[PDB]
Amino acid sequence: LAEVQALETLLARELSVFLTEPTNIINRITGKTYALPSTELLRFYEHLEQCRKQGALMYFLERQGTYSGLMLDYDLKLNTNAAPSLESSVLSRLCHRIFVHIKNSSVLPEGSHKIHFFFTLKPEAVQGKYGFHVLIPGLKMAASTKKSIIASLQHDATVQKILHEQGVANPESCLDPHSASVPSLLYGSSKLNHRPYQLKTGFELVFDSSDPDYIPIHQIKNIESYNLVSELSLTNEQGSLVRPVYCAADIAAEKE
């Protein structure tokens, strides 16, 4: 733990400079809030990944803010008491359905862009409920656009059919309706009494405004070869694999 303590004091000395005053990151272990600029987020995520690779206990939260990446928090009750299979072919269709509502939102920028979907599930169940996040960290959109996509996915009959076929006993009440507001847990961190979400697989989706009908979805190879906490952050913009796709958003109106 010696090398973990060295990083913990390093984080404390590098983030104390950004202590909130009369907010994007919360350290629930220490109860201190910080206002980090985007230029300094990559160094922060670089230090967390070091602590993650050593199994350090951390509990950092990331406020989704008004304009950031999209997260979908599912809390599913399964037909059996075992964790969901979540085969790659099933999650690929989920990506397609999620993207159909993204394209229909009319916020995507012009040109060719790479979208990355990430699926992390909770290791153990809480109150008989299993959960998994669908992180689209590089695709930055407004909070209202997230509520539109979330509301559409709640009524998406195709998504409900897939979940029910996988054994989900609550396909209509599993998607958190407040997914656009809850802070995103950084990858390696979790509550003291709960295990951290583990990344199963990610998918790469290439989209071109020229040909909108061609939507190839391929699985990501060597995801663990990247700074996972940085690639999965909804507010990171300096990732290597995940490159930001800035969607249309009225910044000020979205805050008001």
Resolution, rounded to a tenth of an Å? 2.6
176 annotated to a ligand binding site: yes
Cβ distance 209 to 108 under 8 Å? yes
213 annotated to a ligand binding site: no
Cβ distance 77 to 169 under 8 Å? yes
197 annotated to a ligand binding site: yes
- The Cα 5–Cα 7 span in angstroms is 5
State the burial class of residue 72 (Cβ atoms within 10 Å of its Cβ: 0-12, 13-18, 19+): buried
Cβ distance 237 to 37 under 8 Å? no
Half-sphere exposure of 57 (CA within 13 A, CB side): 8
- Bridge-partner residues for 226, per DSSP? none
Q: How many CB atoms lie within 10 A of CB 154?
A: 16
Q: How many CB atoms lie within 10 A of CB 120?
A: 20
Q: What angle do CA 226, 228, 229 make, to 5 degrees?
A: 140
- The Cα 159–Cα 163 span in angstroms is 6
59 annotated to a ligand binding site: no
Cβ distance 188 to 196 under 8 Å? yes
- The Cα 117–Cα 246 span in angstroms is 16
73 annotated to a ligand binding site: yes
Beta strands in the chain (DSSP E): 25-27, 32-34, 60-62, 67-76, 112-121, 130-142, 184-185, 198-208, 217-219, 245-246
- The Cα 203–Cα 219 span in angstroms is 4
Length reported for the chain = 256
